[PDB]
Amino acid sequence: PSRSAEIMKHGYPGFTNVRTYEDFVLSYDYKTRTAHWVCEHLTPERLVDRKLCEFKPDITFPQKFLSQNTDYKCSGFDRGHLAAAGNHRKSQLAVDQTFYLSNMSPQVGRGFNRDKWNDLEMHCRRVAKKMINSYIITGPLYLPKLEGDGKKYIKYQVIGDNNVAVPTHFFKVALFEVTPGKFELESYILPNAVIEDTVEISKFHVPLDAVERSAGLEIFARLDPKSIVKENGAKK
């Protein structure tokens, strides 16, 4: 209601099958059976037993477009939450909802979901605690690669009876309000793959344009570019 406007202050990346939860906002893709994007707003103050949580479908979407635990089970992938449970520990209801399958994408486990991707999540929280407001957009990507015939193909696995898409990569875009009305921007794209623990997350910095162009989204479109005072660690 008013919370959703707080979360979405800087713009909707898109308007497709939008659902507003207690403490995050999500756009769902009926074709991939995972999200287009999720948006979160963090503050030091906003940053309960996670063990009570249950992976389950959000049944406010049509049945024919749901993913299920059986799709992820024995798939070789984790149920990887886009809006991290660790970002929503203010109430049991908030964290419970991060375990909805609409907020999950199939993720490589060891080496990614459990490690380097988690490192990135921890980074955003660490910085968010020193900031006024923070906004995080997170979502899957399906990126082309050149093949042996010299042509470009998008190729991605689908898992389970419901053919849930396994993204090739994920994006995360963080906006940190360092001083009132002034923001630091950080944009990342990481492969859905085993990543060495030694790889610093800055190696995955990309221009925001890359995220937008690849995802088909318009990110922080309400925000005046002149209010961005730092971008991927570089002063502006």
Add this chain to the structure above:
Amino acid sequence: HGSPSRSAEIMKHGYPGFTNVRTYEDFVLSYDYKTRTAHWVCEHLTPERLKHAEGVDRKLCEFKPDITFPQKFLSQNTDYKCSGFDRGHLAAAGNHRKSQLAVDQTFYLSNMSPQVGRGFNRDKWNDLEMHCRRVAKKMINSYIITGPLYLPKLEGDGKKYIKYQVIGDNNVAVPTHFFKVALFEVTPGKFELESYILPNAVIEDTVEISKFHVPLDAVERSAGLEIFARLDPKSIVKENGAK
């Protein structure tokens, strides 16, 4: 006086989705920023609308981007040029015969998908389009929803993959298949439904279009869309020629 406004008339039986919608003069389109082609298009035909207004000429139309979408999500003629694929119109030029503007707009790249030419766009796919017009000439109203599909195949590792080429600087998706669903009003409030999925591939000319019938549910699951979702089932008197 009460004759409906055009977009309302076209969309009488519901929007399959609401993403990046463009209402053109004589068809409605939902555009996919990720694939740089449509999610779906919807058209409404009647026998009268299939009577050509003399002087309207497809020869005067130009393929061109609809520049009202953000630049970074546009396709261009150069994406298709030398790609190995035709610019295949989802809402067919031949369905829009009553004004030059109306047919001009079918040549917007938003309404184009990369299609195999010989044996598909120019042949079996066109056979399906012609079939729909032939049937529409005998119905009170006809509604057609058309769109691209990206469908999985089982590979040798025992895993399923969706794989499709992307073409040009803008990485326009080449759909694996296309769907078409036609709703034919045969008597007031009663409808015949026809649903098809064809591969974006060379198809033998001798193959009957009816070989590509699928249940509507199949199209919906594949496309991630809710198609003719407001229809009472009792209003449907025939499905894929049956009943």
